[PDB]
């Protein structure tokens, strides 16, 4: 079997592990949906106001 | 570093303000490319722009930065994402690497834990790319697929999937946080026709790309075999589908467990009436009496079970079947006892027979005006209910 197909396998595990470990969860889910970090804001602000 | 396509525009009509979200999305996209896909690279959550995605690159674009605004924009915005996604894509392909082999395409229903699947891979020294869309429609990806076997490069491709419903509750919460879901009409259009878009895609490629499967109603189950993924993704027409979820929305706002705006957001641009009209009861009934009513369907043994029980007063027996109640006409004034209610139809009992109104009507909500057993006309002047009570007692 391929890399890919062994890194997937394991994906899945943690995908398991995220219904019975709840701090795992919330640790996952905290950054995916967060928004751009107050550094890269900070540049795109700059990118955004000096392009009108 | 242009563009590797055309930015398609979407009509917005006489909506002014998505028409000029759109117009500064493509113009910010097509002139400061470089400097996007820099930032996209080098400072997002993305393993140095390995990670491709047209929902990251949203949050680039300035109409995107507030959390309220999101639902919105997100149509206007969304097509020149997707052309700079397309764009890093190529830019990714074009890096001299001899040890990165492996370009992995990750799809499926929008909520059904993509992402959060993505997170929980760990990158590799053979991993080269990372992209995250739909296939159902896979003309696109034809030519992504086909760049990566230009360069002898190892594609495999993961559909990931989920129930509808249980997909459309975790949207919700995203809406919640993040401020974007996902529409019903694009959640229906990608589970119903990405069986399609697979098989689609193994005839054209066949051996050279790899198709798996996920199946989250089954604790991540791995699907290793492409006729197993297809039997996991065949979860029903779009038509299907979209009525299910349509109902499902309705009845979920109705309730009072989602706002208003979590609604308008997986509503759509959806008429939910005309799919709610599409609905069939060929094989349902109601049976009334001084307990209250009953949903019943028949199977093809000529067996009718219960469905479901509604308890009522004041109610005489009878037997109604729904699937030959006549269409109620625009502009008339129907009399008569409601015998039954859903999230799509109301169902009334006049004197010239059973009488179907659908449960919206020109987004005003027939089905809260009216109960079970209640005794009322229905009738629309000029795009606009009333509904009288015609009770009483003497
Ligand atoms: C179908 C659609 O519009 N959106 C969906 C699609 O995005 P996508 O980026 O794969 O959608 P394409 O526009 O089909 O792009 C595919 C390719 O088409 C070329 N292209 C595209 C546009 C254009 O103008 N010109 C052009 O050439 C280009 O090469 C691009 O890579 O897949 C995502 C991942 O499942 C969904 O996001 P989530 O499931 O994560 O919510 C997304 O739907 C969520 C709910 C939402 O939209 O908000």
């Known amino acids: 079997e391929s890399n890919a197909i062994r890194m997937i396998k394991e994906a899945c595990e943690k995908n398991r592990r995220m219904m019975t470990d709840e701090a795992f969860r919330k640790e996952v889910e905290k950054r995916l949906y967060a928004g751009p970090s107050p550094e890269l804001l900070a540049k795109l602000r700059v990118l955004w106001a000096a392009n009108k | 570093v242009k563009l590797s396509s055309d930015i398609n525009l979407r009509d917005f009509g006489n909506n002014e303000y998505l028409s000029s979200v759109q117009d500064e999305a493509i113009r910010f996209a097509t002139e400061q490319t470089d400097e996007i896909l820099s930032l996209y690279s080098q400072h997002a959550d993305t393993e140095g722009g390995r990670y491709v995605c047209a929902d990251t690159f949203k949050e680039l674009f300035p109409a995107f930065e507030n959390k309220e605004d999101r639902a919105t924009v997100n149509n206007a915005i969304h097509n020149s994402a997707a052309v700079l996604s397309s764009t890093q894509f190529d830019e990714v392909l074009k890096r001299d690497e001899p040890q990165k082999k492996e370009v992995i395409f990750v799809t499926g229903i929008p909520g059904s834990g993509k992402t959060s699947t ?81 098989k689609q895609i193994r005839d054209k490629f066949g051996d050279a790309v790899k198709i798996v499967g996920i199946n989250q109603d ?56 005309s799919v ?64 039954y209610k859903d999230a799509a139809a109301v169902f009334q009992k006049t004197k010239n027979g059973l009488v179907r109104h659908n449960a919206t009507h020109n987004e005003e909500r027939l089905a809260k005006l009216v109960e079970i057993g209640q005794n009322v006309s229905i009738g629309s002047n000029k795009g606009k209910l009333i509904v009288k009570s015609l009770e009483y007692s003497a």
Do not use: H
């Not at chain 2, 992504?144 to 249980?166: G, H, P, Y």
């Not at chain 2, 929305?249 to 957001?265: M, P």
């Not at chain 2, 094989?283 to 079970?305: D, F, P, Y």
């Open chain 2, 118 to 198: 993505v997170k929980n891979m760990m990158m590799q020294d053979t991993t080269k790319l990372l992209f995250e869309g739909q296939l159902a429609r896979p003309q696109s990806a034809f030519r992504k697929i086909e760049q990566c076997l230009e360069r002898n490069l190892e594609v495999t491709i993961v559909a990931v999937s989920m129930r509808a419903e249980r997909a459309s509750d975790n949207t919700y919460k995203r809406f919640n946080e993040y401020g974007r879901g996902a529409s019903i009409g694009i959640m229906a259009d990608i589970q119903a026709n990405l069986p399609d878009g697979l």
């Open chain 2, 218 to 273: 089954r604790n991540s189950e791995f699907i290793d075999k492409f006729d197993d993924v297809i039997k996991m993704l065949s979860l029903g027409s779009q038509e299907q589908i979209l009525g299910r979820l349509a109902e499902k929305i309705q009845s979920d706002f109705d309730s009072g467990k989602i706002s208003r705006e979590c609604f308008n957001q997986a509503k759509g641009s959806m008429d939910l009436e």
């Open chain 2, 276 to 339: 709610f009209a599409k609905k069939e009861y060929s094989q349902q009934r109601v049976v009334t009496n001084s307990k209250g009513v009953t949903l019943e369907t028949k199977s093809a043994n000529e067996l009718w079970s219960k469905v479901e029980q509604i308890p009522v007063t004041g109610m005489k027996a009878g037997i109604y079947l729904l699937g030959q109640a006549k269409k109620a006409e625009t502009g008339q004034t129907y009399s008569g006892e409601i015998i």
